[PDB]
Amino acid sequence: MTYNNVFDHAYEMLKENIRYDDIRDTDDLHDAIHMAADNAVPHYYADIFSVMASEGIDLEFEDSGLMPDTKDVIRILQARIYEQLTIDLWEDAEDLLNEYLEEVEE
Amino acid sequence: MTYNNVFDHAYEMLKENIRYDDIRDTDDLHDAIHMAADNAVPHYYADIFSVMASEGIDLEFEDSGLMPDTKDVIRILQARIYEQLTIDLWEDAEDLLNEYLEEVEE
Ligand SMILES: [Cs+]
Ligand SMILES: [Cs+]
Ligand SMILES: [Cs+]
Numbered sequence: 203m204t205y206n207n208v209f210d211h212a213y214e215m216l217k218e219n220i221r222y223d224d225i226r227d228t229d230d231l232h233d234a235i236h237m238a239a240d241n242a243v244p245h246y247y248a249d250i251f252s253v254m255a256s257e258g259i260d261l262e263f264e265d266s267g268l269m270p271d272t273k274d275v276i277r278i279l280q281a282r283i284y285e286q287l288t289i290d291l292w293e294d295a296e297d298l299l300n301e302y303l304e305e306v307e308e
Numbered sequence: 309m310t311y312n313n314v315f316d317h318a319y320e321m322l323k324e325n326i327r328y329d330d331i332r333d334t335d336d337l338h339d340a341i342h343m344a345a346d347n348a349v350p351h352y353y354a355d356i357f358s359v360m361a362s363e364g365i366d367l368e369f370e371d372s373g374l375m376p377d378t379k380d381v382i383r384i385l386q387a388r389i390y391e392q393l394t395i396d397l398w399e400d401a402e403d404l405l406n407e408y409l410e411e412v413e414e
């Protein structure tokens with residue numbers, strides 16, 4: 203299981219969420235991006251470790267506020283996947299909102 | 309342009325997506341089904357109206373969560389095509405996964 207496979211599942215969810223709620227502006231994207239991330243983080247420890255081993259994600263947090271102060275190592279790793287997803291989905295936000303708007307024409 | 313012509317294009321895409329990623333289980337089909345649907349929805353208003361006029365699709369949604377709360381009528385119609393595609397492709401999921409698995413023999 204790789205970070206690229208997890209990111210593809212999150213990107214597809216956000217695409218769906220955009221259509222289901224007719225989202226047109228980045229200022230209304232926060233919750234859709236975070237649900238997509240939540241729905242894409244792996245659940246099994248083994249998949250979480252495999253994702254951390256693959257291309258596209260490092261161990262350091264960008265914002266330490268999204269890092270839990272906890273002794274549970276697996277939660278720290280899950281929180282890091284969750285954070286990278288949200289960052290990468292935000293970089294595709296404008297592109298995705300344009301593709302949605304542009305998919306019909308009279 | 310008819311719903312049957314749109315569905316044929318989506319069915320063929322999902323068939324391709326199954327081969328390209330060696331998909332073997334329905335629990336791994338979600339994203340392939342939704343991409344196929346997305347790629348098959350018509351873009352021109354006229355084709356969207358012609359599809360709604362043809363055999364195989366009604367105006368009511370099965371899950372209202374897939375219906376956007378919006379004043380844009382054309383988006384509501386597109387969302388209904390998208391939903392019917394996903395429903396009909398899910399009814400063919402097992403059949404398609406069996407045809408893929410069964411296409412080779414030693
Ligand atoms: Cs890595
Ligand atoms: Cs914290
Ligand atoms: Cs991008």
Ligand SMILES: [Cs+]
Nearest residue numbers: 360361362365
């Ligand atoms: Cs009809």
Ligand SMILES: [Cs+]
Nearest residue numbers: 222373375376
């Ligand atoms: Cs909705």
Ligand SMILES: [Cs+]
Nearest residue numbers: 399400401403
């Ligand atoms: Cs069927």
